[PDB]
Point group: C2
Chain length 176, copies 2
Amino acid sequence: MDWGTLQTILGGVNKHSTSIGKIWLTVLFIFRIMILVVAAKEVWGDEQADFVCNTLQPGCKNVCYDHYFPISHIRLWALQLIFVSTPALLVAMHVAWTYTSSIFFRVIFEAAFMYVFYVMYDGFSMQRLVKCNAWPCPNTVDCFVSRPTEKTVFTVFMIAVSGICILLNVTELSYL
Amino acid sequence: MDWGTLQTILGGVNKHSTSIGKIWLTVLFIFRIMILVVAAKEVWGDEQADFVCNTLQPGCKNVCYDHYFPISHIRLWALQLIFVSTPALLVAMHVAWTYTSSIFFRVIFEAAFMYVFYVMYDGFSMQRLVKCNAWPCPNTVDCFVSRPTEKTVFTVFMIAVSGICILLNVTELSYL
């Protein structure tokens, strides 16, 4: 891939005691894109052949995999970014009803993804072994995970990023 | 094999209103020997490669096999017969402290094997699937059996035989 190949005329800088946010926020935008693609198919890209189930039950790997991973972290992120992406191309150029409502959209989205995330991954963690007692899964069986530490780390990162994103997003939203 | 090849001089028969038992009891003795050897290594002779455990746990077949089959039925029988065998060669010829105590021994042994049996195989049955949650057996796993019906049948037989053995054994023990 390659994303962004024309940014040369940016001599105009800020002078006020504000609009520091847009710097921080474009930086976090670009950042999160890199951070994503660089580790995109490279942490969670694997986790299909990595959910070993101690059994001889047919299918129970698939069963428990959806049971505990309806969706992977990186998708909720990918979405979180895209919904939080549309205000970016908006704020690309501003001076001359929406504009600040773009800022607010950007806030509330990111908030939503945080909440529903912690609803799903309660404990902000990756259990080393998830058991499973699904229908075909004849009793409570065991179902492993690879690299739970890893995924936990990058999750801590992205959530911290979400917090700072919103804090400057809102710190300039709160101009009154 | 071949067991018993000299029995010709038995013209002397009983005339009293008793000693019918010794007929019945020698018949049951010979019977149970045949009944055994004919189906000896031929119902329970197999059951080593016949205890399938749905798992990928190493050893868990052996583990659960001993767990649920410390010993097979046919051994408890084999013993039951042998302990109940010694009074037979005694009562081979009788007329002329032990003699009736042989009869009583024969009773109480067979009783013991009945009790301890039902202690172990509670329900007078063969479960089609025994689960298992042993140490190495990581969770409650499944562990199959072959021919549980079969073994149940022949068990019903041998226990009925035990009952009749004792009933005539004792009916002549109860002479007063």
